[PDB]
């Protein structure tokens, strides 16, 4: 695979780890009740991502989600590559990549 495909794969894994962190925070914060909302959280995440209309707002939401996730091993191993990929590539393609990562989220067994 070419370099761009590797960068895209690391971005997918980075987003998945960020969602791992956010879902862990949701589980910890709302342990009360029968079950915390995750399916509703996933639907809200999709709605927020589709809400973004230009590069500025979408990049703001993406960065905010990334920081909210926590430590990001995939984003640890690759700083400059993923940072340049985020800054350079058009925000729409980033939206496709984020949605694909959302749909590809492997639950922790």
């Amino acid at each position: 695979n070419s370099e761009e495909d590797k960068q895209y794969l690391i971005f997918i894994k980075v987003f998945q780890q960020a969602m791992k962190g956010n879902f862990a925070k949701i589980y910890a914060k709302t342990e009360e009740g029968k079950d915390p909302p995750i399916k509703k959280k996933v639907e809200r995440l999709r709605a927020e991502l589709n809400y973004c209309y230009d590069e500025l707002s979408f990049k703001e939401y993406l960065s905010d989600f990334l920081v909210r996730g926590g430590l990001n091993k995939y984003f640890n191993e690759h700083q400059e590559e993923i940072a340049l990929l985020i800054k350079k590539s058009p925000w729409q393609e980033i939206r496709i990549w984020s949605l694909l990562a959302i749909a590809s989220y492997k639950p922790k067994d």
Binding site: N50, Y51, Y53
Partner: protein
């Protein structure tokens, strides 16, 4: 002698949600596509302006075959046998059965947004409590001026006097199909570039171009003027009117430029009256 009327008029500044494309999700996608400089520009369908002119003709006498109900939201045909000799609608816009099929006297181009469209989205909710799938929705708008190009073959009209009502309607265009309830956008024009010549050669395409990202200055162009300076598009055949006149009169060396000796009227009504007089004199009406 053959005669044609080519023109490109510019709308006023305001919000626009006139031509929703597909409504992908909750977002009623305001239809858009690439334009000058590779920036995404929102579009207003030319069929929308044709429908607006049809409605204008129907509203004020002017027998038309297709009557818009305004109550049942349906179109009624007075006579299925289209007769361009009598109806204004058939004579002007043409028809197709699938007979004569006409050709249409009026040729329209899709209206383009003079400014690129970034995201311009808007929320929508339905009161409070008891919320269903229809409660939350989005609508795209656009705060620009729209520009479109049109052309009529004068000779091709069955009744030569029918050119006057279309000019009156373009000057007084009714609501163009769109979200008038939420985004009431008047499509009346504020700057006109009309040419009335006897050969098909039709410059003055979408000349109005200002870019200047998010603004409302609406400068005329550099290429159109270039053309005017070079020698073609003779000023005697050009008609410019509207707010663009104010910008034009402030250009340096305007007194010596060939653009000066063109028909320039700051008021739109005066220029339209003069053009109507010229057309009536030329066509023998």
């Amino acid at each position: 002698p053959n005669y044609y009327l080519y023109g490109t008029v510019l709308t006023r500044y305001g919000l626009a949600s006139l031509n929703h494309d597909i409504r992908r999700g909750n977002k009623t996608i305001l239809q858009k596509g690439y334009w000058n400089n590779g920036k995404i520009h929102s579009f207003v369908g030319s069929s929308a302006i044709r429908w607006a002119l049809r409605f204008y003709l129907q509203k004020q006498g002017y027998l038309v075959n297709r009557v818009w109900d305004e109550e049942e939201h349906i179109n009624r045909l007075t006579s299925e046998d289209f007769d361009p000799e009598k109806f204004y609608d058939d004579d002007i816009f043409g028809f197709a059965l699938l007979p004569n099929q006409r050709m249409g006297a009026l040729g329209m181009n899709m209206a383009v947004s003079l400014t690129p469209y970034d995201g311009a989205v808007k929320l929508g909710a339905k009161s409070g409590r008891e919320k269903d799938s229809t409660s939350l929705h989005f609508t795209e708008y656009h705060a620009t001026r729209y520009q479109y190009y049109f052309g009529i073959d004068a000779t091709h009209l069955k009744d030569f006097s029918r050119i006057l009502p279309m000019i009156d309607g373009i000057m007084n265009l009714p609501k163009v199909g769109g979200s008038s309830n939420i985004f009431n956008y008047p499509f009346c024009p504020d700057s006109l570039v009309f040419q009335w010549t006897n050969h098909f050669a039709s410059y003055i395409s979408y000349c109005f171009e200002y870019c200047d990202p998010k603004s409302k200055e609406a400068k005329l162009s550099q290429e159109f003027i270039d053309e005017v300076e070079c020698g073609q598009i003779d000023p005697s055949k050009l008609w410019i009117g509207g707010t663009i006149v104010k910008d034009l009169q402030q250009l340096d060396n305007f007194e010596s430029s060939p653009l000066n000796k063109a028909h320039i009227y700051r008021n739109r009504n005066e220029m339209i009256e003069a053009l109507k007089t010229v057309i009536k004199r030329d066509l023998g009406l």
